[PDB]
Each structure stands twice: as structure tokens, then as C-alpha cells.
Amino acid sequence: KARKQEIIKTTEQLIEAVNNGDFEAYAKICDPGLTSFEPEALGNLVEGMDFHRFYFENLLAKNSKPIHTTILNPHVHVIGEDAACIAYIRLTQYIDGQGRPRTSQSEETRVWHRPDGKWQNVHFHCSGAPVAPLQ
Amino acid sequence: KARKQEIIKTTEQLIEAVNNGDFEAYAKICDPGLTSFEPEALGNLVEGMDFHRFYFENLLAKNSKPIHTTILNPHVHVIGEDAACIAYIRLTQYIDGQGRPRTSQSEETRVWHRPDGKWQNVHFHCSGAPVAPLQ
Amino acid sequence: KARKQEIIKTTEQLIEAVNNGDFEAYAKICDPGLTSFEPEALGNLVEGMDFHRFYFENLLAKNSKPIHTTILNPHVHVIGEDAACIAYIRLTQYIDGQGRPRTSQSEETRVWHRPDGKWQNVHFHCSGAPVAPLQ
Amino acid sequence: KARKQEIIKTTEQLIEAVNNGDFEAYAKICDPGLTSFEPEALGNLVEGMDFHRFYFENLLAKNSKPIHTTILNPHVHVIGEDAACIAYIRLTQYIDGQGRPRTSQSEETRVWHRPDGKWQNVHFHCSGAPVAPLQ
Amino acid sequence: KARKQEIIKTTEQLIEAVNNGDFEAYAKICDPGLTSFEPEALGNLVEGMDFHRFYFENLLAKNSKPIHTTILNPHVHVIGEDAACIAYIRLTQYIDGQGRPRTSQSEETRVWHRPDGKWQNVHFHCSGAPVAPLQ
Amino acid sequence: KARKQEIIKTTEQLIEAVNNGDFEAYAKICDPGLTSFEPEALGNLVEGMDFHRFYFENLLAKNSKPIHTTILNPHVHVIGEDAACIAYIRLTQYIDGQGRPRTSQSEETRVWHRPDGKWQNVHFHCSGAPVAPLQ
Amino acid sequence: KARKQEIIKTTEQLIEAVNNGDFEAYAKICDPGLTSFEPEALGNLVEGMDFHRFYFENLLAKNSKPIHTTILNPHVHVIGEDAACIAYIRLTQYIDGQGRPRTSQSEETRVWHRPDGKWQNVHFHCSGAPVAPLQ
Amino acid sequence: KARKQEIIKTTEQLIEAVNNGDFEAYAKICDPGLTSFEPEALGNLVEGMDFHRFYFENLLAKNSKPIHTTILNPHVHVIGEDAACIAYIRLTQYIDGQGRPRTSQSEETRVWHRPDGKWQNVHFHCSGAPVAPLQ
Amino acid sequence: KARKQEIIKTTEQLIEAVNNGDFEAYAKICDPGLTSFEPEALGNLVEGMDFHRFYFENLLAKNSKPIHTTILNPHVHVIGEDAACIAYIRLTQYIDGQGRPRTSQSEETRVWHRPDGKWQNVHFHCSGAPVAPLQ
Amino acid sequence: KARKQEIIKTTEQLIEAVNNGDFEAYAKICDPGLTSFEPEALGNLVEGMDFHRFYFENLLAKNSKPIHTTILNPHVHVIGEDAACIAYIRLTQYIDGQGRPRTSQSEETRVWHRPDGKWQNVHFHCSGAPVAPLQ
Amino acid sequence: KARKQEIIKTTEQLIEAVNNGDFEAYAKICDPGLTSFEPEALGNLVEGMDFHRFYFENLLAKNSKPIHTTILNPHVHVIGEDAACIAYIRLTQYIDGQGRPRTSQSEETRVWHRPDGKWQNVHFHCSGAPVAPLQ
Amino acid sequence: KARKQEIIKTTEQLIEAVNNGDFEAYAKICDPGLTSFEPEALGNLVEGMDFHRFYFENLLAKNSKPIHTTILNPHVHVIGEDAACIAYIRLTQYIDGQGRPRTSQSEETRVWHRPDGKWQNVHFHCSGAPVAPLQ
Amino acid sequence: KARKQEIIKTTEQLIEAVNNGDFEAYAKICDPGLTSFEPEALGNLVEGMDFHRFYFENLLAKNSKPIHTTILNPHVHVIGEDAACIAYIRLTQYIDGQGRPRTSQSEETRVWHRPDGKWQNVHFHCSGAPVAPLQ
Amino acid sequence: KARKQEIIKTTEQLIEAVNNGDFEAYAKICDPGLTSFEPEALGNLVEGMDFHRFYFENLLAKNSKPIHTTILNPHVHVIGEDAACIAYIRLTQYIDGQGRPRTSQSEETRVWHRPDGKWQNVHFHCSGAPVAPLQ
């Protein structure tokens, strides 16, 4: 019961890092063999870090607008001593180029494993909106 | 290396069962606590079997058209003695109501665990097209 | 903790009655001073039973199609010995006039009171789709 | 008969606070376990204060335009010594970015309980327009 | 206080007569100098009975479909011993040519006078939908 | 015959006051229990003065453009010693934001009563265009 | 004052003849040098009877549908012992090819002269709809 | 034969006055009981001078652009010693806001009477374009 | 003055022949070196009879519908003992494939010469609609 | 054979004059009783010079752009000692308001007579584009 | 001068053969090394007979509708004892699937050479419509 | 075999001259009796040099943008000692008004003759795009 | 030079087999490790025979319509004793469901290798239209 | 197995050169007889270097924006000692003129041969997007 809390804590940390534009921080939580389905891949299965490094260097760098993220009804499956899965709904509140409020939704899955006594994210599937807020 | 083959074999079996409209068969491979993201849920996270039982009783029952399914570039992560994850691209070839050929694509993730010495599917995330071919 | 279960049980019963087209049954669970916000009222606050009696006599009577209803993440507030409130999301699966599957969503609130030792529904607010499935 | 007046008085106070952009004031009238259905949640059931805190910090702060709000035909149910429900129609008059007059309508439900001898709002369902005037 | 009830009673009777297609009955309640604003006049002020006699002879005659009419929040002004005014909102529920339910709204004013000890309708203004249900 | 002239005279005075933006003047001619149907109410029946006070404070204040109003074919019913009704068509000529001429039409009903030996307007129904010229 | 009545009587007779499809009757009331502006002339000024004779032989012949015509607010100028002018608005109620009611408006001028002690129509200008009801 | 010339001469004079923006001149040629059908009246029959006085004070005042008017195929009926009617087609050439040439057509009727030994225009019907050139 | 009448008479005869579908008759009135501008030539200048012979053999042959043709304001120039030109406007009334009346306009020029003591048409220019009625 | 050359020479001269904006020159070649069909007349037959004088005073005056005109396949009929007709196709090359090249086509007829030993143009019919290049 | 006639004669013969659907005849007039630009080639340069043989076997075979072809203003260049070129405009009149007349235009070039004392067509360029009439 | 090379060489030279805006050079290679089909003629067959001289004086003069032209798969027929024909596809690469690259295609035929021992172009047919690059 | 002929011969044979619906024949010419880019794969790289086997069993089986295929300008590279590449343009002529002719274009590459002394196709890239004719 | 690595290495080098705008470098890796299918050729098969030289001189020269290219799932066939083929999917990430991120996909084939002991690219087929990123 206590193990579900630390998956949600770790997941929160990861999302924080991304919104902060901290590539250094992000690289410590992801497995170096990470794979992902996301809208920016145009239906392709991407693998490794360097496809993502572009957005941390050229988009997230300029992040100045106020933002808020809410995680709704997380379901955690624990499937060994060192293995976990989480499914959740994500709401992001942001302000657009007109100065008006906006909200966008994505539905998301992450898979976790614990090599060397540290949790690492090995896979990610993002659906509905992209990871960055929709336009 | 040999453990990746049996995940792909088991995944194939599951997809076969669905196309066949065999609810009995389908219920043996899924965990009774299965959860899923799929377009038919309208962005909601559904849990348990009875949301799916409707399509096996009222749609799949009438399945008469010829169909072919191809799995492209499956990536398998093995994350314990009894835990596995698979990501893949799915192409379905089918014939429409005009009698013309059609093809549709979905991109898909499944998570697997082995309680009682049998593999069970615990989570599913489907993206692009629905599980049944698009119109 | 046990009182939340009987609100969800009673709410289920009410929804059953409506789908069944049982006006007799429906009249026993509702307060005779019931009020409602629903799309069929065109933004107006209707009160009493006879606005609803039309659909039980002229629409629900003919109900023949297969249907399934799922209640997602019900939140119950208990606010006295004899007073309760419930908020929930409703998914309805149905088959259309072409013979194709459909799903529709509504988000809903009900308020309950217990005069004479029996639960009665005193107010209802329906949002998104109407009470009957959308077209 | 006298208890219906103090529900309408309290409801008026709450709406005043929101239009004024007074988060401090707003937090005293709402229950800390408040839940709401509103268009900004995109069909989701939100809970707690911090989803709302964003608009008091980033939108309502800048409120400068003249505004008027009218409550039409409030119906109050009183359902214990310490429990009440109110349904009402809301008209808001405002001036747009062109300097022209506008009016918008919402239809609304609030549920009230009296712990510690003070009325607290425990649930809210907003329909038609959002809480802030429509564009 | 009692005089407001008999205006609402008389108004109900008139609406009944129209839906029934009873021209004989309708002619007894209206003043022979009746005037009206209604959508069928195309923005013109019509006077006397023979413009209306057409619909009782050629449309209302064929009235076979089920119908229900609800009067919402009637306001009555009494302005002498023998003079009254009523404003109200009207909801009509009907079934269309596809066999589907429909609802339409009109907002309406009637003026009443009592020559020879019998109430007579002297003016009518109809707005939103026409007197017969909208298509 | 002479009593029809003073209703038309009084009605003219009222319309003058509105176009002039004289709230003080307007308040003396209307009954404090005035009710109205007008397009700005969005199909609702408004009552009392403060819904109208907004336009005298924020729109009519700025009235600078040339305007002309013509009343066509007024019909007056006199229904006691102290009670009257008037129906009329209104044409307004105005100049738009391009500097081009425009004309708009509304069709209108007013009801009058004479408490304390002074005529007061008790009800108003406006149809076609709003009270202010259309855009 | 009495001479205005016989112009309206004569005008009524003419309109009757046209709706009846009586070319014989129509030819007795019109001057043989009649001229007209009407939509069927496509902006041209037609003169004499034979342009009109086509519609009495090929359209009006088949006239079977129920019809009603109302003349609103006729203004008559009398301009000698034997000379008159009339301006009026015409409403026609008719039933369309779907079996639904319709109404159309035209605004019309006729000029009259009395050679040989009988009134004759010398000119006609028709505007808005054509002489026959609009589609 | 000679009397047809002076009607065309007088008609020319009137049109000149209007294009010149000479309200003084215009008032001498029209009967004080003039009536008209024109597009600016929105299908209504206007009477007297003050509806027209607006355009001489606020539009025609600014008339600066070059203009030319041509009268085509005038037909004159003479119907007493002191009574006449004229029907004609009018072409107006003008330059638009882009500096490009434009032409517009109207088809027109005027009725004339001679009280006190001076011709006066008693009625006017304008069709196609308005009196001022079309945009 | 008398020579203008015989040009209009001859022109009438020609138009009669065409509507009648009489190629024999048509060939006697036209010069064998006839040239024409008409919409059927697609902006080309056609010469001789055989381009026209197609419509007399394959379209005009089937002419069964009622038709009427009116010639408006013919202008004739006579330019020798044996040479003439005519310009005119043509209105055709016809019944369409729905059984509804229609009217179409063309504007037309013909040139005439008298070799061997018989008038012959040497050129034709047709504008607006084609020679046969428009669809 | 030689007489066809002088018609084409004279026609060229006329077109030159128009493009040059020389009203003086143009008036010497046209008959004072000239008539024309042209698009600027809106389907009407204009007669005399003053309708054309407008374009020489207000459009052609400003002619500054480069222009070229080509006459294609002129057909000349000679129909007396002093009477001629010409049909031709006209291509005009011009530069538009963007500075891009444009070409437009018209198809044209002119009729010529020789009073007092000088050729004069008595009629003109222009089709496709107007006389000035199309936009 | 006489050699231009036999090119036009030979060209006529070829077009006859095509419309007749005579592949045998067509093959005798074309060079076996014929090349062509035509719309059916989709912008490609086709060479030899077998691309054309398809339409003689599967389209032209069924040719039943009446057709007429006119050749306008042929220009012939003769460029040796045995070499010629022709440019021309082609009008085709035909009847469509509704039974209505149609006309289509193409502009065309053919090149001719005389090996073995017989004229042969060596190249063809077709522009505007295809060789068969347009739809 | 060697004669095909000098036709392609000469054709290249001509295209060079046009792109260079060298009218002097262009006039030496073309026959003074040149004819052409090109889109700028609007479906007409133009003859002689002066229609083309306009573009060398008013468009090609300003040619400043970079351009490249490629000739694909030229087919040459040689049809005497002094007579030749060439068919080819032309690709032009250019930069537009936004500064973006563009490519356009035309398909083209030229006919050549050798009077006085120098090759001269006698005919040209251009299809798809115009001679200058498309917009 | 002779080796280019046998590649074109072999390529022709393959295309024949496909149009014939001969899966047996097709399997002998392709390498069992064949890969392809084609529109039916939806941008994916397919490998092996069984994706293609569907169309030979369910589409090509029913092939009844007349068809013709033309190969334009094949370029062959020979790159060893046993290795070759071919690029070509393909035109297909076919008849549609209306019975009208159609043509479609694809541009295509094939790669060939000679194991065991027999040519085998190892790769295919198809662009523009699909392998079967476009709709 | 080792030979597949050097094809992928060489292919990477080529793509690098293109993005860098290094024409010198690009010319060393391509065969001087290179052929290509690419969208810029408009369906044509181009051959040699000078069609490509335009983009290295006029587009790639200005390349300043950040860019990233990813090669997905390369398949290599090796078909001799000196002959190879590669098929791959290409994703390009770039920033647009608004400063927003973009991604585009192409699917691509290259053929390689080793004359003189150096690998040279002999053919290229590009599909989906062009070689430069899509707009």
C-alpha cells in the first residue's frame, strides 16, 4: 500500500522536471533505453534520449508563461519487488498568446523498473494532446 | 532472448481471440483487474471485463468479412522473472461496405505479469484507430 | 462508510427504472416536489412529474435496442442522519439506426433526503448529453 | 420560511467574492472538500481549492470592466436542521473588447451544510456558460 | 389574490381550445376586436378573426400527433375591477415527422377585459416560436 | 376619443427619455413593479429597474450619433377609467460606424395604468430588433 | 368620404378575378392601354393585355389550392371627379407542395380613371413578391 | 400632346433637386400629404416630409462625387385637366470609394395633381435600387 | 416612315419560323452568306447555315411546350433604298421541366439588305441569353 | 475589294480615339443618332452621346498604363454605295494594379453609313468584356 | 495555292475516320512513328499506335449519338515539295446524357510528310478539350 | 543523326533569348510569318511579332530573379533537306515573391524550315503553363 | 547493351502476372525476402509475401474490366555480373464504374539480383498512384 | 554483417552534406550519372547534377534554423562484392517561421555501387515529403 505512494511521488518529480526544462534532471529518472509513443513522433516508436533533447534546448528553454498541472485518478499496478505500472489523466492549465486562460487534457501510461536500487522509467505512451500544451 | 519470443506468441494469441469473437478464450488471457485506454471509452480509464463483453455479444458476433493483421517492429522489455512489457505497430487489412479494400493503423502497448505460472495481461493502451477497424 | 454503499445502490435502481420504462417504479423513488435541469427543458428549471411522464408514455415505451450503462468514480457526501448528495460520470453504450455501436457521456448530480424512513430524490442536474442517448 | 432567505443571502455573498477576486474571502465560505462540475474542467470532476486558485491569481486579478449579475427564480430545498440545496438561473451583463454590451446565461446548483455553526458550500454544478462571462 | 387564479384558469382554457382545433370555442373567449403580433403576420399588426380562421380550417383540423404544453412562472397584473394582464413562458413538447421527440419555447403576453360580466382577450403578442410548434 | 391622444403623447415622452439617456425622467413614467420581454434578457422575463439602469449608465451615456424615430399605425384599447393598452410599429433611422445611413424595425406593446392620478407603464414586450438600434 | 369606399370595393373585385382565373372578368376592369411594373417582366415596363393572358391560360387555370388575401391600411388619394390612386400592403396565405402553411407579402400601387362612367385601372406597380405567391 | 412634355420637365426638376441636396426646393414640388414606397422604409408605407428630411440633413449634404442620371422611355397618362401619372426607368452613373465607375438601375412611378394652378407630386413608388445609388 | 413597319414585320416572321422549327422557311429569309455571334459558338464568329441546321434537326423538332415572345422598343435605322438595321429587346415566356413559369431576356441586332427585290438577313448578334430559352 | 480596306482603316481610327481619350475626335466619327448595346448600360439600349461623355471626362482622362489592341479576322459586308457592316474579335493586352500582365477579349459589331461623303458609325453592339479592359 | 486545299481535305478525312470509329482507316493516314500530346496522356509524350487502339476498341465502338464538327480559320504552311503544317480551331456540337445540346472547343496542330507519294501525319498536339467531346 | 543535334542547339538558343529579354536576338530566329498557340492568346491563333513585343518591352525587361530551364526527352522528326519538327517537355525552376523555390512544367512543339540557308521557326504550340513561369 | 533488354523483359513479365492475378507466377519472380514501399502500407516498410497475398485472393480474383499498361522511358543501371536497377514511369488505361475511360500514372523503382542463375526482385518503391488503378 | 554498417555510415554522411549545404562534398559521394524521383521534379525522372545545384546555390545557402534528422529501421540488401541497396524512414525536426516546432516524415530508397574502390550513389527515390522539410 505504501509502494503506490512512491510511484506517484516519482511520477510527479518527472513531470516537474519536464515543465522546468531541466534536461540534466530528466536524464537521471529515465532509463537510457527509454521508448515512447507521442504525437511529435507522427505515429512512430522513438527510442533513446536525443529526439527529446531538441525540445529541452529549443522550446522549454523559453518557458516563461504561468502553468499548473493536475493528475486525476491514478491507478498503480505493482508487479514484482522492483516493477510497477501507472495509468492517469492529466489536466494542464495555461495562458495563450492572447492572454486568455486555456485547459488541455492528455491520458497517459508509464512503466517503471528498479535496477541498482533506483526507479527508472522504461516506457511512455501519451494520448490525446502532446506533452506540451495544445494549440 | 528466448523470453521475448513467448511474449510475442502470447500477444498474437490474444489478438486472434478478439478477431474470432471468442469471449471465453479472451477471459483466460486477461487479468480480471485489467484496465484500458481505448477510443470507445471517450477518454476515460475503464476497468474490468463487462465494458468489453458488449462488443463480443453484439458486434464481433456478426464478423463475416475477410481480415488480415500484421504486427510491425515489436519492442519487448523484460523487467523481472515474471514481468514484461511490449510496444508495437498494428496494420489491419479489411474490405468495406462498398466491397473495396481498406487498411488502418493503430499503435499499441500491453503490460504482462505471471501469477500462478500463467501470463496475464494487466493493462492496455490503444492509440490512433480503435481496436476494431476504422470508418 | 456503509451509508455510501446504499446511496450508490439506490441511484443504480433509479437509472434501471428509467431505462426499463417503468413509470410506476420511477414515481416511488422520486420526491413529488422533484426539480431538474436537463437539456430537454431548454435551459429552464422544470418541477413535478408530468413533464417526464411524456417520455415514459411515448419514447421509452418502444425501447427495444440493447443498452449498457457504466457509473465512473462516484463521490458521495453525507450531510446529516437523513441527507446525502452524489456526483458521478455516466457512460452509455448503445446501437444506432445503421446497426453500428455508439457511446455517449453525461456528468450528473443527485440530491437525496429520507422522509418517512425511505430515501427520495429531491433534485437532479444533468450535463453534457441528455438522459436518453445522444444523436 | 425564514431559513430560505439566509441561503439566498449566503449564495449572493459567495458570487460577490468571486467577481471581486477575493480568494481569502472565497476560501472561508467553501468547504475544504468542495467538488465541482464546470466547463473549465473539460468534463472532469475536480476536487479541492488549488484548481480554482489559478484564476484568482492570473485572471480575476485584472478585473476592471463594469459587470452586473441577476439571480432569477431561486428554488431552495431545506433537508435537515443544518442542510440545504439551491437551484437558480444566472444572467451576467458585461462589456466586451469592442466596447459593446453583452449578456450571458448559466444555470446552476449549490449544496450547503452547517458544520461548527457556519454554512459551507460542499458541491457546485455549473451549466450553459462558464463561471466567468462567455466569449 | 383569488383574481390571479381565474386569469390563469381562463388562459389555460384558451390554449386548450387552440390545440383542440375548436374554432367555435375560440371565438367565445376572444374579443371580436382582437389584435395580434405573431410570426405568421410577417411583422404586421393583424386585427379581427378571419386571418386565424384559415389555420383552424386547414392545419389544426388534421392535428393527430401527441402534444403537451407547460406554462412557466406566470406574472399577473390586475389593473381595475374588470381589467387584467398576464406574461408567461410556454414550453411545448411534440413528436416530429421522423418520430423523434422535440421541445420548443415561446414567450407571450395577453391582455384581458370584462365587458358584460365575461372575460374577453383584447390583445396578444407572441415571441420566439410561432403559436404552432416550430420546424 | 380624446383619451387615445394622451396615451400616444405619454408613449412618445417615454421613448424620448430613453433616447436622451435620462434615467431620472425614465423612472417617473415606469411603474416600480415594471416587467419586460426584450432581446437583452435572452428569453427571460425581467422585473424591476436595475437591469435597465446598466444601459443608462454605460451605453446611453455616450449617445452622440444623430437619430430619428417614427411610430406607425398605433392601435389603442381603453379598458376602464384608468387602464389602457397600445400596440405600434417603430422605425429608427441612425448612422453606423462607417458613416452610412441605416434603418431598423421593432414591433412593440405597452400596458398602462393610472394610480394616484398619473399614468404609469406596468408591462412592455419588444420584438424584432432590440430597444437600441440593431447591429 | 364615400368615394374612398368604392375604390377599395373595385380593387377587391379585381384581386378576386385574378385569383379566380377569370380572364373575361379581368379584361372588363383594366384599361386596354394598361401598363405594369411586376417581377415577371424582369425590370421592364410591359404594356397591353397579352403578356398577362399567358398566366390565365397556363397557370391560373390549374388553381386548386386554398388561398386567403388580406389588404392592410389602404391609402386612397382622390384627384378629380373621375380620377383616383390607391396604395396598400397585401398579405397572401397559401399551402405549399409539402402541405405546410405559408404567407407572403407584396406592397402595391394602382391608378384609376373613369371614362364612359365606369372605373378602369390604367397603371400598376407591384413590389416585394410577385402577383402569384412566392417560392 | 404638349401636356406630356411639362410632366417630364417637372419630373426632371424634382430629381435635380434631390441630387443637389436642396430640401427647400424639394418641399415646393411635393404635396405636404406625399406618401411613398421606397427600400429605406423596409416595406412600410411612409407619409409626410420628416422621414426624408434626415437624408437631406445628414447624407445629401456631403454629396461631392460626380454623378449622371438618364431617364429611359417615359410613359405619361393624362387623366383629367389637372391629373397625370408617369412611369419610367432610371439609370444612375457614379464613382465608388475605390475610384471605379458604377451604374445602377431603378424602375419608378410618380402621381401628379394640380391644386392652386401648380403641379404637386402626391405619391411615389421606387423599385430595384434605392433613390440614392446602390452599394 | 412606312419602311420601318416592313422591317419589324419581316423580323417577326423570322422569329416565328425559328420557334416553329421550320428550316425550309428559315433558309428563304437568311442570306446564304449569313454570319452570327451567339453563345452556342463559344465566342467564335460562325458563317453559313450548317451550324444552325443541327438545332432544327435535333432540338427544335421536339418543341412541344407553350411559348410566348415579346419585342420591346425596336429601333430601326434605314441607310439606303435597300439597306436597314434593327436593334430590340426580346422577352420569352416559357414553362420549365417542373411545370413552373419562366421568363428570359436577350438583347439583339439584325442587319438587312434587299438583293433581287427581297429582304435578306446578312448578320446577327445575340447577347444575354441564347436564342433558345435559358436554363 | 478596295472598299473593305477603308472600313477597317476607319474602325481602327475610332478605337484609337477611344483609347486616347479624345472626345472631340470621337464625336466626328460617330453619328449624332448613335445607339449602343454595352455592359455599362445594364441591358438597356442607350442612344446619343452624353452617356459616353462621362467616361471621357472621368475615367479615360487618367489613362496612363501601357495598352495594346489586336483586331482578329474582321468580316466586312458592303450593302450599297454608302453602307457597310463589320464584325470582329478584339484582344486587349494591359497591366493590372499589381503590375502583372493581363489580356481580355470582346466580340463586336459596328454599322456604317456615308451621309455628306463622310463615313459615320450609326450602331454598336459589344459582347463579352466591356469597352474598357475587364476587372 | 492548290496544295493548301489537299492538306485541308486530308485533315478532314482523318477527323472523319476518328468520329466513325474506323481503326483500319485511321492506321493508313498516320505514320507508324506518330507522336502526340493529348490530355489522356496526362502530360506525357506518347508514341506509336497502341495507346490509341484502346479507344477505337472500347469507346468509339459504341458511338451512337448525333455529332457535328466545324474547322475554323485553318492556317497551312508548306515547307518543301513533300512537307506541310496546319493549325486550326475545332468546334464539336453533341448531345449529352440529359438529351440537351452541348458545344466544346479544342485548338490543334498537325504535321504532315509525303514518303512513297502518300501524305502521312507524323505529329499531333491537341489543346483545350480532349479529342472526344468534354464532360 | 548529326542533323538532330543542330535542331536542339538552335531550340536552346531561342529559349535563351526569351529568358534574356533580347527582342533583337529573338527576331532573327523566328520567321516574320510566325504563328502561335499560347495561353496569353485566350484560345486564339495569333500571327506576326507585335503581340509578343509587348512582353519584351514591359515584363521581360525587369527580369532579375534567378531561373533555370531543363529540356526533357526531345523527339526530333527530320522531313526534308531543309525541314524539321521538335516535341519536348520543359521544366522551369524559379523563386517566388515570398523567396521560396518553385517549379513549373509546359509541353511544347516547334516547327522549323531553312530558307536562305538559315533555320527559322514558323510555328509554336505551348501547353500546360504559359511561356513565362506560372502563378 | 543486351543485358538492359532482359531486365525490361523480366519487368514486363512481373507486371503481367500482377494484372492477371496469378499469385503462383508472382511468387517465382520475387525474392522471398522482398521489401516494398507502397501506398497501401500507409507509410510503413512491409517485408515478405503475405501482405500482398490478400489482394491476389480478394481483389485481383475478380478482375474482369479491360486494362492496358504502358512503360515510358525506362532507365536501367547494371552494377555487377548479377545485379541491376530499373526506374520507369507507368501509365494505366482502364474503364470506371460509370463505363467511362480513365488513365492513372505511377513512378516506380525495382532492384534485381541473380542468385542460382535466375533474376529475382529484392526491393520495390511505388509513388504517385497505388499498384492497382486509382479512385 | 560488417558491410551493413558502412552503408549506413556512408548514407549518414550524404544526408549531412545536404543539410550543411556543401555542394563540393555532395558531388564526391554521388555518381555523375545519378538519377532521382523527388517531388520537385513534378513526377519526372531527372538525371545528372545541375538540377540539384540550384538549391545548393539559392536555398541551402541561407540555412540558419536549428534542425535534427533521425533514421528509423534501415534495411540493407547486399547484392555482390561492390553493390548495395538501403531502404529507411526519415524524421526531420525543425522550427517554422512562427518560431514553433515542426516534424515531417519521408520514406526513402538509395542504390550504391563501388567503382574504383569508393562507394557512389547511382539512384534515389524520395516519397512523402520533399528532401527539404515540408510547408
XYZ file of C-alpha atoms in Angstrom, chain K:
135
model
C -2.177 27.712 -103.664
C -3.726 24.469 -104.750
C -1.520 22.483 -102.278
C -3.294 24.122 -99.260
C -6.608 22.613 -100.380
C -5.346 18.990 -100.342
C -3.919 19.376 -96.766
C -7.376 20.577 -95.543
C -9.063 17.739 -97.494
C -6.712 15.133 -95.967
C -7.157 16.590 -92.426
C -10.951 16.353 -92.849
C -10.692 12.732 -93.843
C -8.641 11.894 -90.741
C -11.169 13.569 -88.355
C -13.963 11.661 -90.156
C -12.265 8.353 -89.575
C -11.827 9.025 -85.838
C -15.504 10.027 -85.330
C -16.545 6.925 -87.342
C -14.523 4.597 -85.249
C -12.648 3.128 -88.149
C -9.258 1.971 -86.810
C -8.350 0.396 -90.169
C -8.848 3.651 -91.989
C -7.076 5.647 -89.259
C -3.921 3.454 -89.476
C -3.450 4.208 -93.232
C -3.286 8.030 -92.777
C -0.991 8.145 -89.689
C 2.767 7.499 -89.843
C 3.659 4.293 -87.820
C 6.126 6.577 -85.891
C 3.342 9.088 -84.930
C 3.817 11.008 -81.634
C 1.178 13.062 -79.765
C 0.444 15.488 -76.932
C -3.172 14.964 -75.763
C -4.956 15.285 -72.342
C -5.418 11.489 -71.973
C -1.588 11.105 -71.779
C -1.531 13.244 -68.564
C 1.230 15.461 -69.796
C 3.364 12.770 -71.285
C 4.594 12.397 -74.900
C 3.150 9.095 -76.248
C 4.489 7.384 -79.440
C 3.089 4.637 -81.771
C -0.490 3.360 -82.367
C -1.399 1.004 -79.450
C -2.218 3.713 -76.847
C -4.921 4.965 -79.291
C -6.180 1.425 -80.279
C -7.842 1.146 -76.807
C -10.396 3.945 -77.555
C -11.261 2.535 -81.022
C -11.923 -0.892 -79.373
C -13.721 0.221 -76.125
C -15.225 3.802 -76.553
C -15.677 4.737 -80.234
C -17.254 1.363 -80.856
C -20.393 2.470 -79.059
C -20.664 5.835 -80.766
C -24.378 6.311 -81.442
C -25.156 9.968 -80.563
C -25.503 12.627 -83.337
C -22.370 14.807 -83.745
C -21.163 17.734 -85.935
C -17.576 19.125 -86.295
C -16.592 22.578 -87.702
C -12.987 23.646 -88.595
C -12.398 27.433 -88.202
C -9.732 29.563 -89.881
C -7.177 26.875 -90.878
C -3.632 28.213 -91.460
C -1.387 25.994 -93.675
C 2.424 26.392 -94.013
C 4.013 24.480 -96.950
C 7.733 23.915 -96.260
C 9.077 21.747 -99.145
C 7.836 19.622 -102.079
C 6.624 16.909 -99.597
C 6.220 18.735 -96.205
C 3.290 20.694 -94.647
C 1.965 22.017 -91.292
C -1.655 23.009 -90.338
C -3.022 24.959 -87.321
C -6.839 25.237 -86.749
C -9.675 25.720 -84.185
C -12.235 22.877 -83.823
C -15.853 23.215 -82.615
C -17.793 19.996 -81.843
C -21.603 20.016 -81.344
C -23.016 16.969 -79.474
C -25.993 15.859 -77.268
C -25.349 14.955 -73.575
C -26.766 12.213 -71.260
C -29.720 14.520 -70.300
C -30.636 14.915 -74.032
C -29.500 18.621 -74.031
C -27.240 20.178 -76.739
C -23.552 20.903 -75.924
C -20.593 22.501 -77.744
C -16.847 22.135 -76.945
C -13.680 23.767 -78.361
C -10.119 22.460 -78.969
C -7.145 24.184 -80.655
C -4.953 21.830 -82.689
C -1.719 21.381 -84.745
C -0.818 18.584 -87.226
C 2.453 17.979 -89.138
C 2.476 16.141 -92.500
C 5.149 14.491 -94.691
C 4.861 12.615 -98.057
C 7.010 9.423 -98.167
C 6.207 6.998 -101.081
C 3.915 9.630 -102.751
C 1.203 9.483 -99.960
C 0.630 12.097 -97.184
C 1.240 10.774 -93.619
C 0.611 12.539 -90.267
C 3.888 12.439 -88.182
C 2.926 14.578 -85.113
C -0.209 15.950 -83.332
C -0.665 18.476 -80.454
C -4.234 18.852 -79.013
C -5.131 21.640 -76.506
C -8.168 22.820 -74.573
C -10.636 19.866 -74.660
C -9.641 16.204 -75.445
C -10.138 14.626 -78.922
C -13.503 13.153 -77.791
C -16.075 15.805 -76.559
C -15.647 17.167 -72.993
C -17.597 16.258 -69.785
